[PDB]
Structure 1
Amino acid sequence: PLLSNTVERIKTTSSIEFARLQFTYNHIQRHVNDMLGRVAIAWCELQNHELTLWNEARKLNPNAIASATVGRRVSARMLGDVMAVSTCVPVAADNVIVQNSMRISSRPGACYSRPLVSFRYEDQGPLVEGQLGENNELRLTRDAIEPCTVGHRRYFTFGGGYVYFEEYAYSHQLSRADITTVSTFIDLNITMLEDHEFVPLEVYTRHEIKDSGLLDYTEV
């Protein structure tokens, strides 16, 4: 050992491959374990760090946060430092009709900022008036009203596509692919290690080594 200033006969095997394999395995294992432990630590820290953003996102729009965290499409309202949550019910796409105009025929100067809708719960149910919402959700109360302004062009989600409204009047539907999309995801590409096969390979066989001798006593 060194430090920085700061009766029986033993039999030895003829092959040393096991020690070399042990060295290779230990080196690879140390590297992979160190790196993957670091990645796990970083993941835990990142999640603990993103909880802070979630704490405010639950305030900005409770419905989306409740839907993404709880596990199912729900509607929630913040009730102090918790969220009161309720599971809400689907409605078929074909049972929804959009009114052509968002203008208020009785109150000039006030326009609905969201499209008005008529939906029925079942295929044979009564017609129910209401207000459209975000990410294909239906609002029962018509309260979204704003002062009417020139230069009104809007898009809204509807089923699997959009509806485009011109000057508080129905213009047309659009497919999802019709609008260019910018990517909000960071790409991470991983490919697996390919399976490999090791064939029997020797520099010299037993027979070649035996034949190397000039004379063999047995044959002679």
Structure 2
Amino acid sequence: TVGRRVSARMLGDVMAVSTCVPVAADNVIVQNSMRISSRPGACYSRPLVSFRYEDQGPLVEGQLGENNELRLTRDAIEPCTVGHRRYFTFGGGYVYFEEYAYSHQLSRADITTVSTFIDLNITMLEDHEFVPLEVYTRHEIKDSGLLDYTEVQRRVQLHDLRFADIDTVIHADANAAMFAGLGAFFEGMGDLGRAVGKVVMGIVGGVVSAVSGVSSFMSNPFGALAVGLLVLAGLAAAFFAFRYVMRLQSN
């Protein structure tokens, strides 16, 4: 719209804008690996870079964004996959990465272009996957490129299922199965069933609540210490008295 590179953001129902600053192509360097050493399960989504604003300035660290943008955050991370392959736009050409490691660089002339909205001359193949064995032995996840709109909504629906299963576990408790078992037994016994069930449910409630109370007390370090000191004193008293009566038993 403006006819130059600009940065834009949506502040609700209106847009905010500012100007971007250019950096020369020879002042940028790309790193050879996308793997994170401190946490083995994670990898970077896009390559890491180092650059300078001026030919003699200090180095700045970042991550390669879309369409030659240099991001300063290093926050695009994903879980590592198998069979990974990517081409990233870089200074009027492309850089090729495979299995989270660098390999070589290409010119924009090395790849064919779909130069019109319609063109039928493409000579495709019927692809056949050469799947890695780790997918079967170690249950590792197979790469699938960038997410599309259908894939994004498929994953959102999978995450809300996992949270729902967690909610069921924290809302419910182990006594529910016991109460259900007791209730199913008493309802089948009619009037006598209710006459006995009403008192049985009361005493069982008294037991589980009493156990919960003493269990809760031990959550406090002083509570845990008090019971620990009591049993330690009991052990000392027991072995002393046992050894003492053994003397009497001896003579």
Q: CA deviation at 1:70?
A: 1.9
Give the whole-Å Cα distance in 2 for the aligned partners of 1:180 and 1:71. Answer: 27
1:132 equivalenced with 2:32 (yes/no): no
| Aligned counterpart, 1:177 | 109
Counterpart residue number, 1:149:
81
Unpaired segments ≥5 residues, structure 1? 1-68, 188-220
**1:16-95 residue pairs with structure 2 within 5 A?**
69-95=1-27
2:33 and 2:52 map into 1 onto residues whose CA distance is 20
Equivalent residue number for residue 44 of structure 2: 112
Secondary structure of the residue aligned to 1:85 is strand
Secondary structure of the 1:177 match is coil
- The alpha-carbon distance between structure 1 residues 122 and 110, as it changes in their structure 2 partners (threshold 3 A), is same
Deviation at 1:184, TM superposition (A): 4.2
- In structure 1, what is the Cα distance between the partners aligned to 2:118 and 2:112? 18
Q: Which letter maps to 2:6?
A: V
Q: Per-residue displacement from partner, 1:55-97 (whole Å, max 9, x unpaired)?
A: xxxxxxxxxxxxxx12210111111122111101000000000
Among 114, 122, 146, the residue aligned to 2:54: 122
Cα-to-partner distance string for 1:116-141 (whole Å, 9 max, x where unaligned) = 00010000010000011111010010
Q: Give the aligned length.
A: 119
Give the deviation of 1:183 after TM superposition.
2.2
The Cα of 1:179 is off from its aligned counterpart by 0.9
CA distance in 1, matches of 2:76, 2:24: 24
**Equivalent position SS for 1:171:** strand
The structure in which a higher percent of residues are strand is 1
Counterpart AA for 1:162: Y
Q: Any idea what SS the aligned residue of 2:29 has?
A: strand
TM-score by length of 2: 0.46
Q: State the Cα deviation string for residues 8-52 of structure 1 (Å, max 9, x = none).
A: xxxxxxxxxxxxxxxxxxxxxxxxxxxxxxxxxxxxxxxxxxxxx
Equivalent position amino acid for 1:105 in 2: S
Q: Cα offset for 1:186?
A: 7.3
Partner SS state of residue 91, structure 1: coil
Which residue of 2 is the match for residue 30 of structure 1?
none
Q: Say which structure is richer in helix.
A: 2
Q: Determine the C-alpha separation between the residues in 2 that align with 1:76 and 1:184.
A: 29
Extract structure 1 runs of 4+ deviating beyond 6 A: none
Distance 2:66 2:51 in 1: 16
TM-score, normalised with respect to structure 1: 0.52
CA RMSD for the aligned pairs?
Answer: 1.5
Give identity over the alignment, percent: 100
User: Which residue, out of 26, 29, 36, partners 1:97?
Assistant: 29
Question: In terms of Rg, which structure is larger?
Answer: 1
Aligned residue for 2:93? 161
Distance 1:186 1:123 in 2: 45
